[PDB]
Structure formats: C-alpha cells, structure tokens
Design a protein around this ligand. Structure first.
Ligand SMILES: Cn1cncc1CN(Cc1cccc(C#N)c1)c1ccc(C#N)c(-c2cccc3ccccc23)c1
Ligand SMILES: CC(C)CCCC(C)CCCC(C)C[C@@H](O)P(=O)(O)O
Ligand SMILES: [Zn+2]
Lengths: 312, 401
C-alpha cells in the first residue's frame, strides 16, 4: 500500500490509520547484549509488529504490515508465520501471494523462509504448474542455488513431474559440465525413473561420462559420477574399465585417473584376483605417487589408504 | 611454508581449455590468493604468520555488547551471535566476566520460550538453530546459573513437538526440515541429558538416507553432498552412536577431496569455491571420522595427524582469512562477521590439535602464540565445557513421563 522505499513512505507511528494501536517496543532486558542499533524505520515497523502480533490482530492492515516487516528482515520466520495465519484467516488470494513470494525469492534466493513459504503455497493450492519454470529462472541467475535445486526436487517427486528433467539436466550440463548440482540432479533423475540396473542405460551413462572425462579430464564431477554409478556393484566386475582408464594415462591424466585406478585395484583385491600381489604393488605405488607427488594436499589420506591396503 | 613454495604453483587450476562459469570463478579466487601468497616476495620481508589475537579480541569484545544496524539481518539469530562470539573468545582463551556472562544468561532466558527451546531473540518462537546456539552458549559459560536457565522438561516437549514419523525433525513448528534439525536436537538433548528411548527413533536412518552417490551428505535425501549438512549428519550420528549407519569409506574420500590443493582451505561442495567457514564444517569431519574408524578398530590410522593437510589449512586461514581490523572472513575481499570469525578459528584449532587416545601432536603455524584452546569436534565448544555440562545434567533424571 505504501512502499518501504517510497520517497513518500512512512512511519507507522506517524500514520492516521495506525493510531489506535500502541507500538510495542522490543524488550532486550535492562542490560542488553549483541543489541542491534536499528534504524528509526526498522524499529518503527517492528514495534508495531510486536503489537499487532501480541494482540493477534488478524487484520488487513496487519497483513500489509508483515510485508514491510519481511522486506526489513526477510529472515524473520516469526513474521513469516503470522503472515501464513493471516493468509488463511483473511482468506487471501494465494496465486496473488504466489506472485509476491516469487518476487521476494528473486531478491533473496538464499533465504530459508522464502522458499519454504512458497512450498507451503504450492501445497495449499496443489498447483505445481509454475514451479519448474520459476526455478529454471533462478537457476538461470545462479546455476547452483542449493535451495532452488532442493525445491525443484520436491516438486518433481511430489507431483511426479519426471518427464523432461533429464532433458533439462543435459541442457545445463552443456552450459557448465562442471556443475556438480546438475550431475547430482542427473543421478537424482535416472535413479528415480529407470535406475542404473538397465544395462543399456548403464552403458549409455558411462559412455557419456567417459566422454565428458575424455573432454575435461580435470573436471572432478564427471569422475565422481562415473565412480558413483559404478562403485555400487563393484568396479572389479568391470574388466575393460581398468584398461580404457589405463589408456587415458598419457592422454587425459590427472590425479583422478590415478585415484580411480587405486579404487579399481581395491575392489580387485576385495574380490581376490590372480597377480593380486603385483596388483597390490601397483596400487601401493600409485598411493605413494599421489601422496608424494601427484596429490599431496591429502597425503594423510593417501598414505592411510596405503596402510589399509596392507591389512585388508 | 607449504603454500609459498615454488612447486605448490603446480597445484594451479587445470582449465582443460574448456572454460565454464566454474573455471572462471575458481581461477579468479586462485589469483586473488596467489597475490596474498606472494605478498612477502614483492615486499621483501620474512613471512611471519601471526594471529591478530588482540585485534580480534577487541572486535569480539565489542560485538558481545552491541552491533550496528548492519546486523538487523540477524535480528532473529541473536543467540547465535552469543555463541559465535562467546566461543571465539573461548578459543582465544579470552575472559568472560562474571557479569557479562550473567547478562547473557539473563538475555537467553528472555529468548527461551514457555513451550521450550529458544527463539532468535526475546519474544520469538522457539527454533532449533537458536536453541542449539543458546545451549552451547550457556555451556561455554558453564555455571549453575547458566545451566539452570535451560528448562529441560520443556525442552523435551518442544523436541517431541518437532519430531517427524520418518525420523526427521522440523526446525520449528510449521517449519522446514533438513539435517540441521537432527544435529541441533541431538546436541542439545544429549548435553542436557533428556534423551529418552524413542526420542530419536529412526533418526539415524533418516540421516543415513541423506548420504548420496558423492559419499557426502545432503540437506535431505536426494540432495547434493554439502559440507555444512555433512557435519550435521555425521556429528548427529556420532552422538547417537551410529556413525556406522554410513559408508564411512566413501564419506572419507569425499571430505578429503574437499580441500583445495592450491588454496589449502576447504570448499562446501565439489566444484565450489573455498570458504573459511568450511574450515570447520568440512575439516571437523575428520576428527569425527577418526574416532569412527578407530572405533571399528582401524589399524592404518595415524597417531599424530588428521587425514587432511593441517599445515595448508592453517596457512590459508592465517594468511587469507584474517581481517586487519579484527575478525576472520570467508576469503580475501569478503567482509568480516562473527560467523566466519567463529568458524575460521574453530577450523584453526581443529588444524592445530590432534589426539587419538593418548597421543597429542599439536601443529602450530607461525608464532606459537597462534595456538588456540581446544574445541570438541561434535558440539564445537571446549571439550572441558562439554564434559562439564553433560555430567552436571547427568545427575538429573531424564524427564520421563
Ligand atoms: C555467502 N557466504 C559465504 N559463507 C557463508 C555465507 C553466508 N552465511 C553467513 C552469514 C549470514 C548472516 C550473518 C552472518 C554473521 N555474522 C553470517 C551463511 C550461509 C548459510 C548458512 C546456513 N545454514 C549460514 C548459517 C550457518 C549456521 C548458523 C547460522 C546462524 C544465523 C544465520 C546463518 C547461519 C550462514
Ligand atoms: C547446527 C547448524 C545450524 C549447522 C549449520 C551448518 C551450515 C553452515 C549449513 C549451510 C546451509 C546452506 C544450505 C548453505 C548454502 O547456501 P552455501 O553452500 O552456498 O553456503
Ligand atoms: Zn563461509
């Protein structure tokens, strides 16, 4: 009704329609701590919120007030709550509200209440029709907004909207193959639709992954993915693995190739294999290289793997 | 210094020539960091890593009393500011005047809800975050008074009020759900000794479902592995004594991969940037993982170090996350705040102190005055405060009903 930002915006204390109420001030105790020095504005709006809340005045004017209170500190979950009460009580047009929250999110895509608030609305309306488009927009401004992705996964699961997400994933991966969120999303999707048991799928997936690897050999995501879909069933069940991997030694090498090999070797040992002795040696040598030369930042770990590799 | 060395310059980013928004940003930080590293060579001084303890102390000392309107954005996390500050000091081995502590006690009391738990400030609905903070705070103080502020009987009620059938908890009535809640609950419940037999029924299983293909743990099952959530998970499991509910192996490989080979610090998510705070959220997992593994009799475990470059991390923090005026920070360029102050320091300490039964190989970078007081890898408060608290509440009966 009156923008927090209008040059013509104003103190509630100062308002004609807000004179029947006495502004309840914050009570931080006689001897404050971590006490914030609020702007006359911030204090104004909240002193009044304290009151309306305290009275539990479920009025239109209160409603409009939480808006101001939220803009002042969108992280204030209490206000976010009372607002939801007003929404139900005053019986407010929710789609209208959807738009509101939509704009707020655009503004603080990293706030926790805003996203939850939206999920509540969607729930209330049982209408996911706008979600995937909205989210995409936000992920369009920050392809890695944890909340957005989280929100998206909820909409997809709850309303079973799996059909075009892989396509989406492929789109984003084309934009930044290093986007771990997408790789994850990719796993989320396939594992909830077809699963990785499907030979064809499995093969498709690795093939693809082996590509991205053999394309950006120092991109760790691809590696963790390939390892991810594989390692749940045993790398060692995968013969050519070692080989093709072995081929990339001079052509697409990184500590990742080595770590992976060390990983294969591990499984090839868990399952027992001829030449194991040698295998163990080859493995231990890699451990040292990674530890001593190739990836020393985690030398503690790499040597620990060398020691474990000793007992088991 | 490990970082100032010439071969360390090979740990620089391999763009593969395929530049994406990610490469770009990473590369960006790397340069900003390089600069800080080469700070010494250009100026011709011997590098001397020092923790601006006094400057930090004056910063903290001040904030514990009042903050600028720049802090309005936190008006709902006051107990947190308490904790952060009250811990940093704690780590800095600084004093907590018997009067200031009281005020804190008194303030938190005002934050405490009649329904149990704590709110972000006086009159706010209870929330697990502030609750976790409040408690830790009170503990850090550790006095009959502080402890007596906590209404155990009500705490339980509250805790139960948020408990979900699938084992998770809400952060607050009508609130969201994610691992944070689990850790929050577990931490406060255990410390105060209010854990009933069914309180955390199935919680361990819920947390376990959060561990994904990355080996890491996410906010809720299905989500990307994340440092902040991973700590909550693990820590939570350690408290319930069920770490084994996870695949610790892959967990280990994930966290360890989170340390930046060139920067020395940690990243919250694969292919994300370094961030001081993760000095704790990520690095703290190792001490937790040590116990765990050692717990299932792991022989290959070190008796002197954590499974991460303690050196590098100390360097990063010391060289890159310290604010001249006082306070620590995300990374160079980023502003200072008590959150990062609280966690950079927490990370430092983690990096400076090792243990493993009776072993004690501390590693203090630069000026020995840089060493900090020790902190508990689960609660993130002085191990002595932890012990002190649990035992005090131990002599109280779990609120059975
Ligand atoms: C951008 N960035 C890079 N590194 C961190 C950030 C963001 N930032 C710092 C933050 C936010 C608000 C105030 C302070 C302070 N002091 C610090 C964040 C981001 C996410 C979370 C989460 N979850 C938190 C957070 C964690 C634990 C307790 C909290 C209590 C109150 C508020 C936030 C808290 C802080
Ligand atoms: C007990 C606790 C409140 C623990 C909180 C631990 C955390 C730092 C959690 C981080 C929350 C999230 C989702 C952060 C992400 O936005 P980002 O990775 O961008 O920092
Ligand atoms: Zn941070």
């Amino acid at each position: 009704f009156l923008s927090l930002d209008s040059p013509t915006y104003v103190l509630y204390r100062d308002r004609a329609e807000w004179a029947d109420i006495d502004p309840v001030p914050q009570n931080d105790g006689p001897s404050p701590v971590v006490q914030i020095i609020y702007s006359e504005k911030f204090r104004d709006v909240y002193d009044y919120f304290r009151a309306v809340l305290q009275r539990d005045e479920r009025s239109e004017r209160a409603f409009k007030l939480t808006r101001d209170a939220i803009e002042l500190n969108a992280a204030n979950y209490t206000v976010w709550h009372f607002r939801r009460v007003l929404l139900r009580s005053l019986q407010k047009d929710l789609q209208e509200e959807m738009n509101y929250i939509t704009a707020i999110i655009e503004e603080q895509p990293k706030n926790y209440q805003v996203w939850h608030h939206r999920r509540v609305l969607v729930e209330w309306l049982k209408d996911p029709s706008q979600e995937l488009e909205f989210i995409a927009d936000i992920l369009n401004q920050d392809a890695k907004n944890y909340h957005a992705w989280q929100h998206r996964q909820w909409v997809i699961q709850e309303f079973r909207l799996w059909d075009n997400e892989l396509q989406y994933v492929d789109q984003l991966l084309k934009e930044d193959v290093r986007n771990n969120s997408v790789w994850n999303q990719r796993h989320f999707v396939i594992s909830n639709t077809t699963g990785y048991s499907d030979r064809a799928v499995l093969e498709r997936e690795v093939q693809y992954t082996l590509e991205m690897i053999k394309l950006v050999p120092h991109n760790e995501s691809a590696w963790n993915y390939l390892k991810g879909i594989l390692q749940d069933r045993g790398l060692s069940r995968y013969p050519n693995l070692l080989n093709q991997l072995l081929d990339l030694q001079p052509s697409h090498s990184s500590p990742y190739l080595i770590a992976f090999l060390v990983d294969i070797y591990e499984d090839m040992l868990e399952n027992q294999c001829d030449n194991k002795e040698d295998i163990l040696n080859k493995a231990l040598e890699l451990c040292e290289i990674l530890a001593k030369e190739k990836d020393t930042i985690r030398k503690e770990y790499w040597r620990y793997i060398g020691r474990s590799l000793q007992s088991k | 210094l490990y970082s100032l060395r010439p071969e360390h310059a090979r740990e620089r980013l391999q763009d593969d020539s395929v530049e994406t928004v990610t490469s770009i940003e990473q590369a960006k930080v790397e340069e900003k960091i390089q600069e800080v590293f080469s700070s010494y060579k250009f100026n011709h001084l011997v590098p001397r890593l020092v923790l601006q303890r006094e400057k930090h102390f004056h910063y903290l000392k001040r904030g514990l009393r009042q903050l600028t309107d720049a802090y309005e954005c936190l008006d709902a996390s006051r107990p947190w500011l308490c904790y952060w500050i009250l811990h940093s000091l704690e780590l800095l081995d600084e004093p907590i005047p018997q009067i200031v502590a009281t005020d804190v006690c008194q303030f938190l009391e005002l934050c405490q809800s009649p329904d149990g738990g704590f709110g972000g400030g006086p009159g706010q609905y209870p929330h697990l975050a502030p609750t976790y903070a409040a408690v830790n705070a009170l503990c850090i103080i550790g006095t009959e008074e502080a402890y007596n502020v906590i209404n155990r009987e009500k705490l339980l009620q509250y805790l139960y009020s948020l408990k979900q059938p699938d084992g998770s908890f809400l952060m607050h009535v009508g609130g969201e759900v994610d691992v944070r809640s689990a850790y929050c609950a577990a931490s406060v419940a255990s410390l105060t000794n209010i854990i009933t037999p069914d309180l955390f029924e199935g919680t361990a299983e819920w947390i376990a479902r959060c561990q994904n293909w990355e080996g890491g743990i996410g906010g809720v099952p299905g989500m990307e592995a994340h440092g902040g959530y991973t700590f909550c998970g693990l820590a939570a499991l350690v408290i319930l004594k069920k770490e084994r509910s996870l695949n610790l192996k892959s967990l280990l490989q994930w966290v360890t991969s989170r340390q930046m080979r060139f920067e020395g610090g940690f990243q919250g998510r694969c292919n994300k940037l370094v961030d001081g705070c993760y000095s704790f959220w990520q690095a703290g997992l190792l001490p937790l993982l040590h116990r765990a593994l050692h717990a299932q009799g792991d022989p290959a475990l070190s008796m002197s170090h954590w499974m991460f470059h303690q050196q590098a991390l100390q360097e990063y923090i010391l060289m890159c996350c310290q604010c001249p005026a006082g306070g620590l920070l995300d990374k160079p360029g980023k502003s200072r705040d008590f959150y990062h102050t609280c966690y950079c320091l927490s990370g430092l300490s983690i990096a400076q102190h090792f243990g493993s039964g009776a072993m004690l190989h501390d590693v203090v970078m630069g000026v020995p005055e840089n060493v900090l007081q020790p902190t508990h890898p689960v609660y993130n408060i002085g191990p002595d405060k932890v012990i002190q608290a649990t035992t005090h509440f131990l002599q109280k009966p779990v609120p059975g009903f």
